[model samples]
Each structure stands twice: as structure tokens, then as C-alpha cells.
Target: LNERILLVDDDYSLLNTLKRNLSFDFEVTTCESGPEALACIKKSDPFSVIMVDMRMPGMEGTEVIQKARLISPNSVYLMLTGNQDLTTAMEAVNEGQVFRFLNKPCQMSDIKAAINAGIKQYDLVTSKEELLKKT
Candidate 1:
């Protein structure tokens, strides 16, 4: 899977671990802050998947995901939470903008599977549009 995935979090070690493991199967980019993620998203090409931590200091995960939905609507989203507050984040991200939620202490395999699912959905969505255009 060569699809691009962006991971936004404040934890340096976690980011390192994700990048190290995920890079073998994906094009992984890590951002340390919500603002940096948004800036990167705006300036770079669309990613197939974007996962953000729900507890960023200034700009929360919900805010980044919601704004990124506008900036890169084609991209699928996932949220990471250290607490059991996924329900609140889900409510904040109404209308199914986010694709999935994973607890903070995720297995690399689980995260890979989550990304795989999102990439498949993204591929199908983009393919459908391309099919119409090719007609």
C-alpha cells in the first residue's frame, strides 16, 4: 500500500513508532501539532488517510478533522484518544466526517488495518468519479 497517511499527535515517541512501522506499508507523515497538520494539508497534496489525537492543546482533534474535511474532503479521517471520550469527539464530528476511532495505545497492526480500510474507501470513491469522467 503506497497510499499517503498523515498522523497528527503531540507525542514524539508515538509519532516515531508510527512512522517507523507504517512507512514500510505507506507514505507516512507526522505532525506534532494541529496547526502544523492543517498547514501541511493545505500546502501538500491530499492524503488518503489522516489520524489525529483528540487531545491537542490549542486546536483539538475535532477542530482539525472538521476543518480538514473542508480542506481535503476526499481524505478519510480517524481519531485517536487516550481516554474513553470518543463519544464526545463523535458528537463533535457529526455527519460521519470521521471514518474510525482508535484508542491511543493501538497496535501497529490495528492501525495498519484501519489505514487499509480508509485507503480502500478512498480508492473506490476516487475511482467512481474517474469512471464517470472517462465515459
Candidate 2:
């Protein structure tokens, strides 16, 4: 697959694991902080999907997703968190417009499914934009 993905988390080990697992199907980039992730997003080509952890030191995941939207409006955002707070999840979905909210220790199959879905969403949005341009 030619899809590009960005994985941002404070946990280095988890980031590495996800990067290793996801690299097979998509081009994966990992960032350890929200600032780093935002910088990466600004500098690199637009990603089809961006997975971000909700809790971090500097910037919250929702904030990152909000800013990322300005840089890559077509990119699908997926929020990941070990915290099971409904408020946080709701904020991510309603305010950040994230495609999905994934709890920590997520099954690999579920993660893969979400990534696939995110990529599909990205494709759908981009295709609509292209069609609109053609019209």
C-alpha cells in the first residue's frame, strides 16, 4: 500500500512497536511528542492517517488533531489513549473530529481495522475534492 501514516505517542516503546507492525502495510512515521508530530506534519507530505495518543506532556491529543486539521484537512485522525475517560473520548470525537478513539492495549486486529478505515476515509474525502475540482 502507498498510504502514509503518522503515529504520535509519548511512549517510545509503544510507538516503536506500532511503527514496526504498521510499516509492512503503510509508510509509517513515529513522533514522541505533540510538537514533534506537528512539525513533522508541516514538513512532510500529507498522511492518509494520523494516530495520536491523548495524554502527553506538552500538548493534548485533541489540540494536535485540531492543528493538524489546518495542515492536512483530508487526513483521518485517530485518537489513542490508555485513559478511559468518556469526556476525553467525546472531546476527541466532537471537537477534534477524530475518525476513531482507540483504548490502550488495543488488539492488533482492531488497530489494523481502524487504520484501514481511516485510510478509506482519507481516500473518500480526497476523491470527493478531486471530483468537485473536475466539476
Candidate 3:
């Protein structure tokens, strides 16, 4: 997968772990907060996928996801949470429109699958946008 991904989480260790493992296939950028993620998005090309922790200090996962949609509407989003609250997961699905809900300590294989799915969705969105502009 040679896609760029924006990974937002306040946990420094977890962020570093993800970067180290996922770097084999993806170009991963880590952010510690919603504000930092937003700033990075504004200055860089759109990411193919975004993975955000469901709970953070300044901004909740849904809020970050919503703002990310505004910056990169084509990017696919995944919500990562340790709680596994069904209600919150449902809300994330309905309101945030996340592509996947990933529990903490996700297996490398599962992460790869989710990333692949996100990339596929990203391609579809970009393709449609390109087609729309030509019409």
C-alpha cells in the first residue's frame, strides 16, 4: 500500500509503535492532538486515510473526524478506542461516518486490512471527483 496516512493519538508510545510497524507499507504521519492534525492537513496533500483515537484531551474523536472530513473529504477514517462502547461506536458510525472501528492492541493483519479498505474508498472518491470535474 503506498498511501499516506494521518494517525492522531495522544499516546506517544502507541503512535510510535504504529509508525514503526506500518511504515513498511504506508507513509504514516503522527499527530498528538486535533489542532495539530488540522494544521498538518492544511499544509500537506490530502491523506489517503486517517486513524484517530476516540477520546483525546482537547477534542473528541468524532469532532476530529468531522473536521478531518472538512479538510480531506475523500479520506477514509477509522475510529480507534480502548473502551469499545457500543453506543459510542454506533455514534461514530452514524455521525462520523468512519470506515472502521478499531479496538486498542489491534493486530497487524487487521490494521493492514482496514488500511487497504480505506485506500480503496479513497481511490473511489478521488476518481468520482475527477469525473465530476470533467462533466
Candidate 4:
């Protein structure tokens, strides 16, 4: 199967743009809200990576990451935030354990690179976990 990605953002235009850019290389599923994302998770395979917008109207990005972790423990989570504040970025890294944070207006190439790296990291961690389980 192709590398699967779940992208959750409140902005419809942004979601459409990402889908257009990433669909060629990824099996991308776009959701407009956190609840929509949670619902999609039930019917879908665990994604290779998930990217979520930070300031959604309902569920915040951190909560979305936490919930996604419950549904798909091995999937890498990336937070896309427009906030450039150092404190907020540090909180997201420390508290959310996000794989990588993307700034708004991120370039397509940068997003692709981050996703590739995130998938590699996901495989590394899960492979070690699986090895541990067998022992």
C-alpha cells in the first residue's frame, strides 16, 4: 500500500491545496475537523503519518494528537501551527510529542521531506517495539 496520510485542518482551501500537492505521492485523506478525523480513523488503516492544524475551532491540535495516538499508536503526528511563539512551539514539542512542527505557508517540498523523515522515524520506533514484544 502507498504511504497513507491523514490531514486535519479547519481551512477547506488549505486542505484542498495539500491534497492536490500530496495525492500523487501519498494516499491522502483530508478532514475538516477533529471529529471528522476521529471518525475516519475508525474505518481506515492506521496512517503512516498524520498532520493537524493547531488552532482548530473545536479540538486543539494537542488534543487531536492525543486522540490519534489512541487510535493509531504507531502513526507519526505533525502539528502545523501558524503561531511563531517559541513558548507555544516548545509546549507542543514537549507536551504533544509531535514528530515535527510545520509552519503555516510551508513549502510543498519541505512538507514532503518532513513526512518522509516522519515515516522513517515511525518505522524505526515500531520495529523496535515489535522486537521487544517478541522477546
Candidate 5:
């Protein structure tokens, strides 16, 4: 919950709600567009987790994450999709390497759990890298 999180979604209401809910526990930054998200990623310190909507105006969620990985390789990605397309979900997981895929309108508990899990994964990966560096 203390982890820094980046949230990207086109829907302003959802973004505002998520920011309000998650900001209680997490350091949440909401971006309304893919380019804005990317700009945030480039300028700010690395976020421990990034949750992005699957559908966006210019860049799809998958593409955003793919590009984001280059800038913040240690950050964990979670895809939020309103669509029920299994193919897209699978691609997000397989190709985009997202840590989790949650459907839109997901319960708050589910979102919390996913974000916690993503943060744990990020910590694990970063710790391993640090350990390796000492060898």
C-alpha cells in the first residue's frame, strides 16, 4: 500500500475514483492519456506498480506497458480491461508481460490485492537484482 503507483485511464471519473480510493494507502498518480503517462514515467522516479486501462485513444494499454518497460523495467504492470476478449488478455500477459489482468468494474478488494501482489513482485525482483550485484 505504501508503494508508488501510476494509474492510466481515459475515463476521468474512474481515474478520479481510483485515485481517491487508492491514495489512502498508496502514492497514486493518475494520467488521462498514454502520452501523459509516458511523460510521467520518464520524469518521475520509478513507480513500483503501474495499472493501465486496456483501451486508450492513441496508445493501447499493451503498447504503453511495452514502452514503459524500457524506462522502468522493474515496475510491475497490471492491465485493466472492460473488454472480455480473452485473446487481448492473453496477449497482455504473454506479450506485454503484465503481472495481472483485471476486468473493469472489479471490486476494490480485488484491485487492492492485485496492487499488493504487484508491489511484492517488484520488491522480489529488485531484491534479487541487488543481491546479484553484490556477487
Candidate 6:
């Protein structure tokens, strides 16, 4: 898959460790916070999948994705964090349009599968130019 994956979180450990762990099979980029991630987006390629943590310092994950979706509308978003519950799940879906809601402490295998699924989504939405058909 021709895909790029971006991950944002305040946790340096989570950011860097996943980048290292997923280095072999995926194109992984990490950002420490929402502001920094925003800064990266201008110079970085439009990622196929963008994953973010739910809780962070100043800006929350959904807000980051909300704003990011403005700049890069086609990228699929995902939530990766320890915060998994009723309200946040709804926010991630309704507000962020997050493609996947992944809990923290997830296996590398799971993340790999999730990212691949996102790549498939990218192909589905962007690969063909489907305009409204004539009656």
C-alpha cells in the first residue's frame, strides 16, 4: 500500500517506541503534541492514516484531528490511547470521523492490521474518480 501513517501524543515514549517498533512494515511519523503535529503537517506528506491520543496537554486528540481534517481532508483518523469509554468513543466517531478506535497497550499485530485496513480505505475512497452518474 502507498500509505503514510502519522501518530500524535504527548507521550514521548509512546511516540518514539511505536515508530521504532513499526519501522519495518510501515511509514511511521510521530508528533509530541497537537501544536507540533500541526507544524509537521505543512511539511509532511498527507498521511493515509493519522492516529492520536485522546488526552493531552493543551489540545485534545479530537480537536487536533478536527483541525487537521480541515487541512488534509482525505486522511483517515484513528484514536490510540488509554482513554476508552462511552463519551470519548462517540466524540471520536461523530466529531473526528475516526476510522478506528484503538486502545493503548495494543499489540503490534493489531496496530499493523489497523493501519493496513486504513490503507485499504485510502484506496477505496481515493483510487477511483466516481462522479455522479447521469440518469
Q: Which prediction has the highest lDDT against the true structure?
A: 5
Q: Where does candidate 2 clash, by residue pair?
A: none
A best-first ranking of the candidates according to their lDDT comes to 5, 2, 1, 3, 4, 6
TM-score of predicted structure 2:
0.93
Once fitted onto the true fold, the runs of candidate 2 whose alpha carbons sit more than 4 angstroms away are none
Kindly list the per-residue Cα lDDT of model 2 for residues 71-118, writing each as its tens digit. Answer: 989899998876665577787788647889888778999999999999
TM-score of each: 0.91, 0.93, 0.91, 0.89, 0.93, 0.86
State the TM-score for model 4. 0.89
Which of the two, 2 or 3, has more lDDT? 2
Per-residue CA lDDT of candidate 4, range 1-135, in tens? Answer: 328899999999988998999998888899998889999987897788899888889788778888878888888888887755445656868875688888867888889998888778878877888899998
Q: Global CA lDDT of candidate 1, please?
A: 0.87
Q: CA lDDT of 119 in candidate 3?
A: 91
Runs in model 6 deviating more than 4 A are 83-85, 129-135
Show model 3 residue runs off by greater than 4 Å: none
Q: Where does candidate 4 clash, by residue pair? A: none
Candidate 5 CA-lDDT value: 0.89
> How many clashing pairs in candidate 5?
0
Cα error, residue 103 of model 2, in Å, equals: 1.5
lDDT of 6 by residue, 1-135 (tens): 557888898989877888998778888888999998888887787788888888898998888988888887778888876755547757768764888888867898888898889888876766663332321
Relative to the true structure, how large is the alpha-carbon lDDT of every model? Answer: 0.87, 0.87, 0.86, 0.84, 0.89, 0.81
Across residues 39-125, which tens digit of lDDT does each residue of candidate 3 receive? 999899889999988889989888888888887788899888775555787777887478888887678789889998989888888
In angstroms, the error of model 2 at 84 is 3.6
Instruction: Specify the poorest-scoring 10-residue window by lDDT in model 6.
Output: 126-135
> Which pairs of residues collide in candidate 3?
none
lDDT of 3: 0.86
